[PDB]
Design an enzyme around this catalytic site. Structure first.
Site, PDB file in Angstrom:
ATOM      1  CE1 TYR A  27      23.827  29.210  49.517  1.00 42.21           C
ATOM      2  CE2 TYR A  27      24.491  27.942  47.901  1.00 42.21           C
ATOM      3  CZ  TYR A  27      23.408  28.282  48.708  1.00 42.21           C
ATOM      4  OH  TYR A  27      22.284  27.606  48.326  1.00 42.21           O
ATOM      5  N   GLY A  29      33.474  29.706  50.159  1.00 44.92           N
ATOM      6  CA  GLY A  29      34.568  28.814  50.791  1.00 44.92           C
ATOM      7  C   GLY A  29      33.825  27.366  50.416  1.00 44.92           C
ATOM      8  N   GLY A  31      31.043  24.900  50.780  1.00 41.85           N
ATOM      9  CA  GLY A  31      29.931  25.020  50.807  1.00 41.85           C
ATOM     10  C   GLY A  31      28.836  24.751  49.600  1.00 41.85           C
ATOM     11  CG  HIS A  47      32.620  33.259  42.595  1.00 43.76           C
ATOM     12  ND1 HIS A  47      33.140  31.952  42.774  1.00 43.76           N
ATOM     13  CD2 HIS A  47      34.069  33.898  42.183  1.00 43.76           C
ATOM     14  CE1 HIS A  47      34.054  31.739  42.417  1.00 43.76           C
ATOM     15  NE2 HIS A  47      34.850  32.735  42.154  1.00 43.76           N
ATOM     16  CG  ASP A  48      29.443  29.385  44.418  1.00 44.34           C
ATOM     17  OD1 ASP A  48      30.531  30.352  44.574  1.00 44.34           O
ATOM     18  OD2 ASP A  48      29.885  28.500  45.119  1.00 44.34           O
ATOM     19  CE1 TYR A  51      34.256  32.208  39.296  1.00 38.84           C
ATOM     20  CE2 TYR A  51      35.589  30.176  39.293  1.00 38.84           C
ATOM     21  CZ  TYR A  51      35.358  31.514  39.490  1.00 38.84           C
ATOM     22  OH  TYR A  51      36.666  32.090  39.659  1.00 38.84           O
ATOM     23  CE1 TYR A  64      42.411  36.456  36.295  1.00 41.82           C
ATOM     24  CE2 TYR A  64      40.649  34.387  36.286  1.00 41.82           C
ATOM     25  CZ  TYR A  64      41.438  35.539  36.797  1.00 41.82           C
ATOM     26  OH  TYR A  64      41.074  35.597  38.269  1.00 41.82           O
ATOM     27  CG  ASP A  89      37.696  34.933  40.062  1.00 41.32           C
ATOM     28  OD1 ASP A  89      36.805  34.339  40.655  1.00 41.32           O
ATOM     29  OD2 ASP A  89      39.057  34.413  39.654  1.00 41.32           O
TER      30      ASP A  89
HETATM   31  C1  LIG Z   1      32.027  36.177  45.796  1.00 40.16           C
HETATM   32  C2  LIG Z   1      32.590  34.799  46.428  1.00 40.16           C
HETATM   33  C3  LIG Z   1      33.234  33.583  45.631  1.00 40.16           C
HETATM   34  C4  LIG Z   1      32.586  32.103  45.999  1.00 40.16           C
HETATM   35  C5  LIG Z   1      33.475  31.492  47.032  1.00 40.16           C
HETATM   36  C6  LIG Z   1      34.641  30.681  46.273  1.00 40.16           C
HETATM   37  C7  LIG Z   1      35.285  29.839  47.258  1.00 40.16           C
HETATM   38  C8  LIG Z   1      36.494  28.899  46.553  1.00 40.16           C
HETATM   39  C9  LIG Z   1      36.280  27.547  46.814  1.00 40.16           C
HETATM   40  C10 LIG Z   1      36.817  26.530  46.216  1.00 40.16           C
HETATM   41  C11 LIG Z   1      38.284  25.986  46.772  1.00 40.16           C
HETATM   42  C12 LIG Z   1      38.418  25.465  48.080  1.00 40.16           C
HETATM   43  C13 LIG Z   1      39.030  24.128  47.924  1.00 40.16           C
HETATM   44  C14 LIG Z   1      38.340  23.018  47.288  1.00 40.16           C
HETATM   45  C15 LIG Z   1      39.344  22.811  45.906  1.00 40.16           C
HETATM   46  C16 LIG Z   1      40.184  21.758  46.019  1.00 40.16           C
HETATM   47  C17 LIG Z   1      40.090  21.286  44.436  1.00 40.16           C
HETATM   48  C18 LIG Z   1      40.318  19.709  44.384  1.00 40.16           C
HETATM   49  N1  LIG Z   1      40.432  19.204  43.112  1.00 40.16           N
HETATM   50  O1  LIG Z   1      39.700  19.162  45.290  1.00 40.16           O
END
Ligand SMILES: CCCCCCCC/C=C\CCCCCCCC(N)=O
Lengths: 122, 122
Positions: A27, A29, A31, A47-48, A51, A64, A89
């Site tokens: 999950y 990054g 995933g 978090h996913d 959201y 924010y 977050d």
């Molecule tokens: C508690 C942990 C949080 C969950 C993991 C969050 C990781 C964030 C992942 C998203 C960013 C990676 C890059 C993909 C974004 C590129 C956006 C674009 N429009 O494609």
């Protein structure tokens, strides 16, 4: 948004930690599948979800109000989906510290076929 | 989902390519503020805007059906938001390939200060 969640991360993680969350579990990054290989990677799931539940507004782009009183996390105004976003977050960033001890490098940049299993609901 | 998405990028724009959208520009990777930079960046953003439009599903956690019709990404016979989410990931993907050379290594990683501005509108 995510730029923040990052700094929100680094903050309670000693700058350069977000890098360890670029691609973790099923999950973290990049995933989104199978079942959460790790609690930390489970921190992600949430978090996913967190959201995923958020009503109407966009997080990747949601901007924010958040602070760090005494090196500690604190979300601004308690009004708006932003209340919500800033929450994930926070928690997230935090859930991290909650399991930074159970981090498996060997879980870095895994492969689909690692999580090919059935999804796991929020 | 990211994964699905991930592949796409590896697909259309060769392998390891993903690693190059891990972060880059105001909207690629972790970000979400101010105006974009060049083209590639725009590519992402919209995706985010695309993701932004959607409702009743979680692009991060969705799992659509796609495939390369032997050479180019293709979102197959859908049934709902996936239809979209895929398309989102889909083009955004194609979108990169559409502007490779334009890539600017130095635009990968900004201090979240290089964007320090207001996110535009979708
Ligand atoms: C508690 C942990 C949080 C969950 C993991 C969050 C990781 C964030 C992942 C998203 C960013 C990676 C890059 C993909 C974004 C590129 C956006 C674009 N429009 O494609």
């Amino acid at each position: 948004n995510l730029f923040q969640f990052a700094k929100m991360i680094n903050g309670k993680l000693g700058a350069f930690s977000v890098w360890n969350y670029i691609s973790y579990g099923c999950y973290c990054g990049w995933g989104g599948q199978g079942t959460p290989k790790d609690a930390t990677d489970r921190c992600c799931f949430v978090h996913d979800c967190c959201y995923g539940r958020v009503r109407g507004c966009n997080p990747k782009l949601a901007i924010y109000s958040y602070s760090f009183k005494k090196g500690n996390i604190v979300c601004g105004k308690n009004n708006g989906c932003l209340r919500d976003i800033c929450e994930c977050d926070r928690v997230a960033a935090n859930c991290f510290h909650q399991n930074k001890n159970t981090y498996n490098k060997n879980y870095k940049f895994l492969s689909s076929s690692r999580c090919r299993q059935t999804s796991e609901q929020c």
